Every structure is written in structure tokens, then in C-alpha cells.
Symmetry: D2
Subunit: 370 residues, 4 copies
């Protein structure tokens, strides 16, 4: 009589789903393909919507401890400050990926979610069968495809989809704050430092706490120096001379990668007892920093619709219908912003842009009016 859930993927969407289900009394197993539990991408921004999921999950406290809300979100064009935005009090937070990952993992273990590493889902059956690459076949009343842009839960079933892998990307790193060495300035701020002249180079400057700074170094793939890993110090120091102490530390990082952006969109998110969540269903452009946020919201809302006493198949359909438009709208707007370079203008966190952040999954309303 205990409902059994099998979750594929140990990213933010999967740990979120697993926790939310385990809290509602599901018997939950989670399968991570990688040989250990880890998050990639250096750092991450969360907002009101995502922090509310964390609250719902019983993991907000561990997240807030040792993370950072900057006094302001600042934008520069050609070293000239063009905007400072605080979103009329709307909560937000910057942290390392590991930090967010550890909190979710620790919460999941505390609740006794069963976790398997080196455990890859290769096939899913909408009647509630999951097949692992070991050949083990698992039965469950619910299957969660949270297995990322390359989701095998998705693709073994067949979902009508558009996927795009961009040619351009960025280099994400964590370095020491070097705050004293930076000298005079507002170095606790989020600072988005755009340039088109003399070259197209941009740094997103993002403190995670008193010790760790998150840097996104962005330049087109066609620029050999800017796209270089480990970082071509000279060309980054040249256009960002004030960040030299941090850029120096960044250049020691041999594991730096130039990762490319990637998006996915599906005509639907469910089939029978199978639900897709996160990048598996809706990877989007980084512009509004809502990829993990939407993923977590949708994962948490999935647990919610499963508490209505309908069949799992009906709940999944009601779930998509309820929650999806927020994601579609955010994905679209984020892609638009990316393509138009809209953030470069500053003051672009309009009410529409913040619609996803403003959403409170817990009470299913929009908060923090702008």
C-alpha cells in the first residue's frame, strides 16, 4: 500500500523530486548515473520561487547558511554602471553548486531516500517499469525522468522535441574573493560586466559568500583567446583590469571548461506513470537564471498534484497543465533576452522577467509585487 517512486538523475530536479515525494510518504529510490554525487557549473543563482521550494523541502536553512544575497544586482556597459536593481525586496541568493547540492543530498539522506550511484536509467515504460544499465528492471507507481538534457527516460519513450546546442558558451569558475586586493568598489554586488568594444567579452561577477567568488567569463567560440581554457589571462585582464587579483587565481584552474548553452522543449512532459522534470523537459538559456528554479518548482509541484487522490496518470496530466505555462513563458523570455543581449541594457528585470521568481510554489500564488 506504500507508493513506490523511482527517480532517474541526481541533479537539483531529481533530489527535489525525491525529497518532496519522501516527505509525502512515498517509498523513494534515486538513481545517479555518475560514479558519485556531484554538481557541475561552479555557481548558481536562486530566487524567491526556488528558495520557497527549499523551504518546502526542509533544506532552506542549510542553504542560507554560508551563501550570499548581494546588496544589489548591478550592470555595467563598458565599465560604466548603467543599473542597480533590488527587485522591491524579492528574495534571492548566490551560492556554489556544491553548496546547493550538499544541502539537497544531506536532506535526502536524512529522510532516508535510497540513493544509488553508478546507476543509469536506460529505458522507461509508461506502465511503471524502469530499466537500469545493469539490466535490473524496477517496478514503481511513479517514474521520474530527471536525467538532464540527454534524458534516456525521455528518449527511450519518444517525445516530440526541439533541441539546440549553441556554438557559443562560457567559462564558469570559483575563485577566492580577493576582496581587499580588489580595493575600492562595491565588491559584494552582483556585477554583470558587458563589453562589445574593443571586443565582445563579458564577466558575470557573483560572490557566493565571504570566501568564494563565482565568475562567468563569456566570449564567442570564434574568439580563440577568449574561449580558451585554461583562461588566456592577458585578454581577460586587459578588459577587466580591476579583477586582476581574481583573474590571476582563475588562471591557475586547469579544470576550467568552455561549456556551451543547450535548450530542450517537448510537446508534453508526461506519459502514463512517467514524468519529465528539469533539463530533461525544459532546458533554457541562462539569462533569467531560472533553469534550476523552474526545475525545482516543477519537481515540487509534481509531489503536490500526487496528493489529490486521483490516479498517478491523471495527477501527472493535471500537474503539467497547472505548472507548465510558467516554465514555457520563462524559457521563451530567457531565450529572447539571450538573443537580443537584453541584459546588457540594464534595468531589464521587469515584472514579466521576474514572473517565475515571483511565483510561490508553497501557496501557489505570486508574491513580491513589483
Amino acid at each position: 500500500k506504500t507508493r513506490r517512486a523511482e527517480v532517474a538523475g541526481g541533479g537539483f530536479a531529481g533530489l527535489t523530486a525525491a525529497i518532496a515525494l519522501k516527505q509525502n510518504g512515498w517509498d523513494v529510490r534515486l538513481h545517479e548515473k555518475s560514479s558519485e554525487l556531484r554538481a557541475f557549473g561552479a555557481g548558481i543563482y536562486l530566487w524567491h520561487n526556488g528558495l520557497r521550494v527549499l523551504e518546502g523541502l526542509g533544506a532552506l536553512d542549510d542553504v542560507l547558511q554560508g551563501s550570499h544575497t548581494p546588496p544589489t544586482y548591478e550592470t555595467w556597459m563598458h565599465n560604466k554602471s548603467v543599473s542597480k536593481e533590488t527587485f522591491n525586496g524579492l528574495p534571492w541568493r548566490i551560492m556554489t553548486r556544491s553548496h546547493l547540492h550538499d544541502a539537497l543530498v544531506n536532506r535526502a539522506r536524512a529522510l532516508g531516500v535510497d540513493i544509488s550511484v553508478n546507476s543509469e536509467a536506460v529505458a522507461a515504460d509508461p506502465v511503471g517499469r524502469l530499466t537500469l544499465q545493469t539490466g535490473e528492471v524496477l517496478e514503481a507507481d511513479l517514474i521520474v525522468g530527471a536525467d538532464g538534457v540527454g534524458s534516456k527516460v525521455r528518449d527511450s519513450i519518444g517525445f516530440k522535441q526541439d533541441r539546440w546546442v549553441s556554438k557559443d558558451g562560457l567559462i564558469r569558475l570559483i575563485v577566492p574573493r580577493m576582496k581587499k586586493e580588489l580595493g575600492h568598489g562595491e565588491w559584494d554586488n552582483t556585477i554583470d560586466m558587458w563589453n562589445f568594444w574593443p571586443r565582445v567579452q563579458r564577466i558575470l561577477y557573483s560572490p557566493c559568500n565571504e570566501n568564494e567568488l563565482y565568475l562567468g567569463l563569456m566570449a564567442p567560440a570564434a574568439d580563440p583567446r577568449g574561449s580558451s581554457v585554461p583562461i588566456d589571462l592577458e585578454v581577460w585582464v586587459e578588459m577587466f583590469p580591476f579583477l586582476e587579483p581574481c583573474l590571476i587565481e582563475a588562471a591557475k584552474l586547469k579544470t576550467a571548461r568552455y561549456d556551451k548553452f543547450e535548450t530542450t522543449k517537448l510537446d508534453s512532459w508526461t506519459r502514463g506513470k512517467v514524468a519529465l522534470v528539469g533539463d530533461a523537459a525544459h532546458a533554457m538559456c541562462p539569462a533569467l537564471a531560472q533553469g534550476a528554479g523552474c526545475a525545482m518548482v516543477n519537481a515540487f509541484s509534481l509531489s503536490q498534484d500526487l496528493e489529490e487522490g486521483s490516479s498517478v496518470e491523471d495527477a501527472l496530466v493535471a500537474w503539467e497543465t497547472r505548472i507548465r505555462p510558467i516554465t514555457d513563458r520563462c524559457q521563451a523570455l530567457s531565450g529572447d533576452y539571450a538573443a537580443n543581449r537584453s541584459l546588457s541594457k540594464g534595468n531589464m528585470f521587469t515584472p514579466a522577467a521576474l514572473e517565475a521568481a515571483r511565483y510561490d510554489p508553497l501557496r501557489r500564488v505570486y508574491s513580491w509585487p513589483q
Copy 2:
């Protein structure tokens, strides 16, 4: 079998108590002595702790709509900016008194709390009798003394107490923002503008929204010009020339008052079926802006301890024991700050100062670590 509560006082503490009790299924009546429901004091700051009570009460949304979180809390000494503080993301909000009052009243009516105006509690009996000035005697399983610094619920029973009414005070007003007329500056900020030379004059500058600015004009009682109502425009414009457009509007206000500060402290907050909440029990200095906050927290926590299935008498005792030390500590620290003029130094919203704001009544933990 329905528990019956009688609440004396329609201030923030009383509306909070009434709502929280009505939500838990209490049959609730609230008695306001004044001939109509109204809040005095122009404007008010709330923090995380208080916003969480609002959430608990189902009234946060109406409060957030049309109120304001400044981008920063700034301090000036002699027109020189000495600090900017954002409390590492800790939520806060500025609003007019009416705004907070209307939200609570509207929520209370929506839940069907019975409200009586021109209804003054003059005597309370710890066995659960309340006597109104009309001579009507009401029975209830719980009596809430939320009737302010001059609480008759308190004094008709007899509580060992220290009360202090200060000689000094301030003039609190709401005027138009006049934002364009203010010209260049950071006019959405909270700005606490201290001066000791050439005179002791201070303005707390506090935007409530795009339309309404909340001003606290502070000068010692012994200064005839500064303490004057309606405001002596010349002496305020002189030391605050940049606020002239607002000060001009303020000087039209004939209802301006120089109210004095007032504190109360009691050796205990309960007797039998009677609980004291708010200024009735713990009026404090304005320095940490936590008078209404502590009041609301304590009122909401009272509802909480009444859900443990113990007698009302045991619940009230467990309530005080649980929640009081936060208030005692905040009151004390606030008085210290007031006396030492500690806020004038800037950067004084230390972790200890923010202890009350950091408290989350809903989950009974401290959040937003500093």
C-alpha cells in the same frame, strides 16, 4: 465545545491575536475602545519575523502590495553617508500604519472575527471574565489584553511593572514622495539622517511606496523650535535643505504631534486565563523597529501554544516561557541603542541587533544568518 476568546484592543497585537485564534477555530470577539478602527503613528517598519506572522495570518499579500523594500538602509552623520546595510538578504518592508492596519482588519473580517468599536475593557478576571465599560460581563476560556501601554486588562488585575514616559519625542508624518523635486540622490533608500552640530536634529527618511514618504523628525523636547507642531519649517529646512520639497508639504500638516517614547516591562505576562500582548506587556524604544514585530510574534505564538491540548492556564505559562526571552533581549538592546545613540554610528545592525528580525515564528527557528 467551541472555545471562546475575548480580545481587548484593535491595534496590531490584538488583530494578530484575533486572526490567529480565529484560524485555529476559536470563537473570537475583539473590543476596540476607540469609536473607529484606526492606527496612529504615520508609518512603520516590519522585518522577517513580522512578515512571517503576516504570512501565517494569511495577510502578507495585501501588505506587500503597495508597500516598499528600500534597496538599502543608509545612515548619515552630518550629511556624510557612514553606512549602507542590506542584512544579507533578510526580508524587511516599510509601509504606512493604515496600510498594515487595513490588511489586518480586512483579514479579520474575512475570517468572521466579531469586532466591536466603542467597546472598552475596564476589568478582567483570571477565571475568564471580562467587563466592558458598558457594564456587560463576558465569559471566555481566554482573555487577551492587547490594550496598549495603558492596559486596563493588565492594571485591573495588578502586574508588578516598570513604566517610563520619556521627555523627548518625535514628529511622525506622511507626505508625498516629491521624488523628482528631490533631484539627484538615492531617494528610494531608507536614510537615517543624524546631526549633533549645529543642533541635535535627526530625520528618519522612509519611503512607503511610490506615492507616500514616511518622515520621523526628531529633536529634544527642550528645543522649542524643533519640537514644535506644526513643524517649524525654517529650522528643519536649514539642517536638511535637500528635503525642502517634502518638508514644505509636511509643514501644511496641522494634525502633526510630538509624541513621546514610552516603555513597559512586567515581571510576568499571564494570570490564569488572561494573557498580555504587545505594548500592554513590553513597549520598548523605537531603535530596532521591533515593537509591533515582537507584539505580532508573541500574539501569533500565543495561538500556537493553545494548540497543545493542555489547559489554557498551562498553555499561557508555556507560551511566556518559550517566547519572552526574545522580547526581553530585544527591548533591552533597543533601549541601550536609544540611550547610547548607537545607530548614529552606522553599521549597528549586528547579528545580535537583528536577533528578533531573524526569528521565524512559523517554523520556530532563526533564519537569514548574518
Copy 3:
């Protein structure tokens, strides 16, 4: 026994020569081709070297009255201030062309220099004959070719020369200061506002006094909108939105012209009794603002070498040899700066750049060390 000088051209170089000669007791006539005495180019910067000539000429006082030394010389790149320079006290001054012109004309009339308008020099003979377009032939012991880049005194004799007329230019205008309307800023500054993105547009912002602002609007000839006269308001307001009140006034000016830069360099400046001064001999790029300065210095120094009791032919040769290298060096450096866009970097008024300004013609030394 009274020495007789004939001067061709009523620009700054010619009025300077005429005055300096008349002060030393020369009988002086000056011939202006144009039908009236007037100066074109809206505004002008002078420096120490040029102000010392003015002093020597007895015309400094009229110049200082109603002109302007900005508190600082500021440079912007993409609306970001990149330098502020004050040249370690070295005197400088901004004024309208008319202002400088009127002072020289008034001084020349006061000394009784004979001035003829509609009087064009078409031929000069190194034995001391000047022919006017009326056919009048004048004899003199000295002939001054101060007749501009198209000097007929020069060309009727034949001077080995390189002349260059550029394709690019700028629009020079005088408009009201509109200082209040500009609002917050440092609007008494000289501000050199460079941009390469999103277009190559630059404004030199140059207050002449409390009433008059001198604007240089620079854009390549190949840009149809930027090079347009009267000014294409939209494309200038777009990249210089903070100057809108002035740009609005500027757009009313129907007489605005897009003048092109022009340079001249000759293997020598003298022949017999004929000397060439100013643009006739050494027109240069505008970068170091030393065209009129060098012209005036060289014109004043010519008067100086004529007081040594040598023949006029020997004096002219000693004159060139003495004074020319300063001009050659300044011309060259200015052309270099122009071509490299060196001023865009800011802080480029190095000691070498200021070498011409630092020169004191009166005492024949370099002053104001850097």
C-alpha cells in the same frame, strides 16, 4: 626711417603679427580679403604659450574677461570617466572665436594699425613688393603671409610643401549652456566624450563662459547621419542623452557646417623680406589644440627677431631657426595623436604633449614643469 610692414590676412596670426610689430614702432598695414573682420570655427582653446602672447600684445585682460578656465579637463570613453587632468597649474582658457577675434581687433585699432577689408594679397615679391587684387602694388621692408592654408603670399612665390585635406571632419557650434537643464554633473568641465560603440561618435564639450557652450560634434564623413548639417538630432541625442537640452538648441542652427581637417608643411617659412606665419606655414591637426597657439607664438617671435638690428632678411632666417622646431614637433605629435586616437585613452597630456603650451614666448623659456 620708419619701417613699413604689410600683413596679409586678418586671422589670429595676422592680428598678432600686426600688433607686435606696431608695438615695436613699425608702420603697419593689414589686408583682409573677406568683406569684414570675422573669425570662424565657433570656439577655441588657448594655453600658457598663447596667453603669454596675449599678455605681450597687451590684450590678455580683454580675453580673460568673459572667458573660462574649466576646473578640470575630463575625458570619457563610453560614458565612463577615464581621466581628469589639470596640468600641474599650467594656465589655459576656453573662449568663442569672436571673443578672441574682437580682443585682437580692438587692440590693433587702439594701437592704430591700418586695416583694410576686401583687400586680398595675390602676389608677393621677396624684395618687398605686395600686390593686391585691386592691382595696387605696395612696398615694405617686411611682408607677412598670414593668409591661411590657401596662402597666395606663399604660392605666388613657390614653397616646397605637403598639403593634406582630410575626408573626415566635425561640426563646431556655440549654444546656450543650459546648465540647470543638464542637472547633476560637472558641467563646467571640459569633457571629451569618446565613443566607438555602437557608433563612432564623439563630442568635445567646452564651456566658454556662463552663457556660451562650445560643442564639437565628430563623426566620420562616411556616416550620413552623423556628418549631417543641420545636425541629425536623433543620432546625437541617442549617444549623448545627457546633452539633450544643448543638442536641441544646436539643431536649430542652420549655418552649421561639417568642416574638414587640413594640414600644411613647408621646407622653409621665409624668402627675402617675406615671412609665412600660421596655417599658411604649418596648419596641423586639432588634437593638442595648438594651431592658433603656435601661430601666435611664431608671429610674436617674428617681431622679436626684428629687434636685433640685423637686416630683415637675416632676422627672418634667425627667426625660423629659433622658433620652428617647437612647431614641427607639436604638429607631428598632434598628427600622431589624431591618427592613433590617442586622446581617447585619457591622461595623454604628457610633458611632451604639453611642450608647446609650456613655452613662454616672452621670456623664451619653458615654464610650468610637469
Copy 4:
């Protein structure tokens, strides 16, 4: 037939007089009471009027080399910048006393002025006799009393006079610039840092060149800590924390003195062949920094009136009548400013205040209109 001048005092006024006279062909001797030629007072401000005297004296170049014109003259009240003034281009300069002293001494020796140290004038006779403390009696056609506030040339003759020695004073020092250690700011500026709260303490911050900073530390005599020598570091660092690296160096200075202000005014400046110049005749308050300036102007103008071919007695009378009102007006205004603390308001270098600086002794007109 060679006119013979005897000058008492080797300060700025006496060296100025001596040089100016020696240039006009006077046979000049100068008597310095002190055992060596030296100037006290750490640093000094000069202006247009004084720099023109230097020019007239043939000593400007040595002065400009290794001295400093700040980009701006800034005023602070309670660490808040209240004004920045550049005097519409009017020349000025800051330098150490020694620097100004050495230039004058070197020029005087170069011209062959005869200089005697340990040579004190004790008596002067208006018929042209000077008596040295050695008992040597010198005859001359002119006697210059440039022997300071305690002038024996003055007092041995008897001049109706008011002298005032104030109770308050200041500590003048030269320390290293420590510019890097000062960090962010405008550290080449003259900065006049006023405070009345929490104490009456003021620093005049005055860079002399890239190596040397001139500091005036001012506090009332009645403050034991502020008036202390060597400096009470703690009380100066407390109110000027940003100057700590310099204040630290200043506290090593054992020769620091708290000198008091002193003024003198006489009903006349001449008697027969005797003229009084400088502090001997017109010591004034430091406020407009024109004590040495007026002294030098008056000393230089004395040489001027001696070239009119009248008797020395008539020239001296014409001299006083011509030049004195500028000094009387400047002295008076400076005393007013001192008493009213007028400079503390900022923007107080009005046209009237700058009247002395604006005066050009060389051409006997006022320049640099404001």
C-alpha cells in the same frame, strides 16, 4: 652716485626687497639676525600676485620646479565635501617654506646682494642710519625694515600700532605624502577638513609636491590633547582616520610646535628714508593665505616707486599711498574670515576674498576676473 640700501631681515619680504632693489642697480646689503638663513612654518600657499612678484624677481622658475598646484581646493565639514573651487583659472601654488626660501636666497646671491647672518638691526634713523647689535652704524639712502612682527627698525623709531597675539594656534608640519597608503580619494587636492563635533579639530591638507605633504593641525589652546606637541596621535587619528599613515609619520616629529597667530597694524609704513614691509607692518590672520603674498607685493612695489626720480622720502610716501589699501582690505577681510570661521562654509573664495591674489604687481592691474 650708486644708491645704497640696507635691509633688515632675511624673510620673504626682505629677500624680495633686496632682489628687486639689486635688479634696479641699488647697492644692497641684507642683515639677518639669526645665525643662518632659514624659513620656519613648514609650508606655504602662494597665489597669482605672489607668483608675479617671483616672475618680476627672476625666481619663478626655481619655485615652480618642485612645487604643486592641486587640481582643486576642496573643503570638508564633518568629512562631507561642501565645496571645490578653482578660482576660474587664477594661478596658485603650494610649496615648503625652505623651497620658497632657497629660491629667493639663490637668486639674491646670483645677483650679488651682500648678505650677513648674525647681523641684527637694533636701531634705525629716518635720515638713513642703521645700527647693528655689533654697534656698527651703516649709512644708506634707503633702510628697509623687514624684520618681522617684532621689528626693531619699527620700534626704535616709534610707530603708532595695534598688536595682537592670539591664545589659539596650530601645529604645522611636513610629512611624506604616503599617497598609496591613503588609498582611494583625491589626494592631490588641497583639503581643508573642518570639524566642530565631537570636538573642534581641523586639518589643512596641503601637498607640496610628489614627496612632501604640508599639514596644519588646528585645535584650541584650551584643548590639552589637540594643542599637544609632539602630536597626540590618538585624538588626531580619531577624527581624521583617513590620514593615519601621514599622522603616524607626523607623530615622530619632536620639533613640532604649537605656534600662535599674531597681527600688527600701523598708522603708517614709512618715516623719512625708512620703509616697513611684511609682518613688521601688517601681519594678518592666515585665512586668505596672503601674508607672504602681500609682503612680497609691497616689497616689490617699493622698488617700483623708487624708479620715479623723486627723492626717496617722496617715493616712500607715494608707495604707501599707492599699495597699502590692498593690504588693509586683505588683512581686515582675513581677520573677519578667521573670527567668523567663514572658510568652514566652503565657497568663500569670493571675488572680494581673492582681490589680493588677483592683483598683478608687474602691470599694476587686476587680472583673472571671477
